[PDB]
Symmetry: D3
Subunit: 145 residues, 6 copies
């Protein structure tokens, strides 16, 4: 079946500085989703201005390292957006990453993709194809029909 | 007061294989609900065809053991359904068992009852009356008016 | 910026007896909110009849100690109400304090303020101005734009 | 390989009343051990006097229900004793069930077996052979050489 | 029985700034111990020089607020020291507060008393007798013989 | 001060398949240690035979992906070994990664370095110097004297 959908989930640098890394990675791991690539990176002037295809928002993203990850699994993009919660923390629900950890729209802990098309372009910017792993998750057989 | 409502909450065998047992039992324990019976059981051809009163769904349920439990407490049936979340994981909310751990409608980790009438028939199938314990939960006095 | 909003969050004595203290304080701590004062107190006939500006509800509140706290941060009042969840536990959602731990409207584990005006009057009743601490939360710079 | 060792782990009725069930079952589940049977039971005058092969200790054990479980896996008996910690809570280490949750030798939350011989006799008393499930844990292949 | 022993457990200001409050309070709550008083306080030149009955250590303790608490229960002082772990984090064991959260002897997250005599003098300095609550913990009957 | 010590902590492929990633990364994050690089990688015949400077142990390490990480902080190497616990799971203590999650010497969930010299050589094999990030951890000032 086509359960090879992959979204891009990155922990913004507030996230990272605040210590929320392992915590955020939980919600994905335990849902049954598949970590497929991951790196820590200080964002580039280029890398960035190409991403967000706000003069102050720039040097925020540069101001810390960023945990860039990629997660494979069915409906992972929408489920990702779900797990993160409303983009403005002040209206995302508890249980979600934004609603558990965030307050400011501007410091909203992480980013996820909003479309299969969004994700795919986003991943290929942030990672080369060599960098991405595929294995079968042992749990696959029990996770999916 | 009539706070003797009892629902049937079973961890389907994905649940069990996936390691989600103690985890699922938390959400009930800590809500204040009362474990009242529990067993691990490999489901029967009979036991099953009588339960679900899909040719492939059968041998799924047989394919692992099942944690059958019974939980007493006020509005426990509806609260159970609430705690488990939407039956299709892809639209149940985070904070719920299905939304935290599940992806596939077909592998949706556990089952709960949908009616007082559902539960009561369900329990009496899955357990004999001798097997069910009653004690007073120490916490009762602080849980309820 | 005016992110000095402060709500009053108290753990009712069910909360306290039931062991939910550290647990409830988590949801606030980890959201990024700032503990600003805290005490354990057995509620007064006076202190109370002035608060709730039900003959049985009185001696409930007297029947255990109460954890009174104050939390500073942006939109903290509404976010507090959000974190606690619907006041009737039987309709508050999982992920919230009431939906995770509560069943009875009458034993709903904690109280939070419903207005900036509510909170401010509530705090000044429950604490003197000397008792309240201000420090800058180290995490402030990463929590807020 | 002979990784079919099984110990008996029961949550004493303090444990149960105190809400420690799911919590205790975690430490076993997540270690990789295999739940193999489980029931809730109010202890019998007979069942008991045969177990502990103290006049006040009797009616303690009768005073609540007991969660009896059986767990399969390599070196499970000794690892069980390890996870529970020193039998006197006041000298068991944190990280263990007794050191995390217990204070009184007399209220030490749970019991585990001390020998393969202890366990086997203990299980056959507490359960019939029909009641015990075997399945292969999906995780087995990744847990063991 | 004399299970009225009380130790003083304070979260140093690293602890507080670092977000470890609720977390630290867990280990005590869930062990079965009784919160008996608590306040947030910026430490005094006087209050301090009287406590520690190092010129740089002074203005560290002043540099944040401090969570002062008092906890009642049997052998609570020694069990407190146990839960905190070795005073130098680099040799305290995991499972303890210092071994889970700490690295530097100088930033060792919290303080606990080392003697019944230590504690009692320490509490009376840090709190007045009015400020301390006694209630019976509901769980007492299940915690103690 | 020289608190720039860095150890290599990798989650072996049991770890990864078993879902222990976020979980393992916690113990490091929350201790105050600094993630400094991270990648997911399927191990190479070359990369490996050069690492372990057992014919069956080879194709085990190849049989899944591996989470390679690097963590900076004082005494991080020894504290790493501490957090992981005894290399044989059957004698590591609870609270440690090996004692919480592991049973078999051969499937012991993760690897850590045993020396500053071990680590440094290990990191330079597993990562290029470009791949490693340095930022100051916001929490540094509160973590260290």
């Amino acid at each position: 079946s086509s359960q090879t959908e992959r979204t891009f989930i990155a922990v913004k640098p507030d996230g990272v500085q605040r210590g929320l890394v392992s915590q955020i990675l939980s919600r994905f791991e335990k849902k049954g989703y598949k970590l497929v690539a991951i790196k820590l990176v200080k964002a580039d002037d280029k890398l960035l201005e190409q991403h967000y295809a706000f003069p102050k928002m720039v040097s925020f993203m540069k101001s810390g390292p960023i945990l860039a990850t990629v997660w494979e699994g069915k409906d992972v993009v929408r489920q990702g957006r779900t797990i993160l919660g409303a983009t403005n923390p002040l209206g995302s629900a508890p249980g979600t990453i934004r609603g558990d950890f965030g307050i400011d729209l501007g410091r909203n802990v992480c980013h996820g993709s909003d479309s299969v098309d969004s994700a795919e372009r986003e991943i290929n910017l942030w990672f080369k194809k060599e960098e991405l792993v595929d294995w079968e998750s042992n749990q696959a057989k029990w996770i999916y029909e």
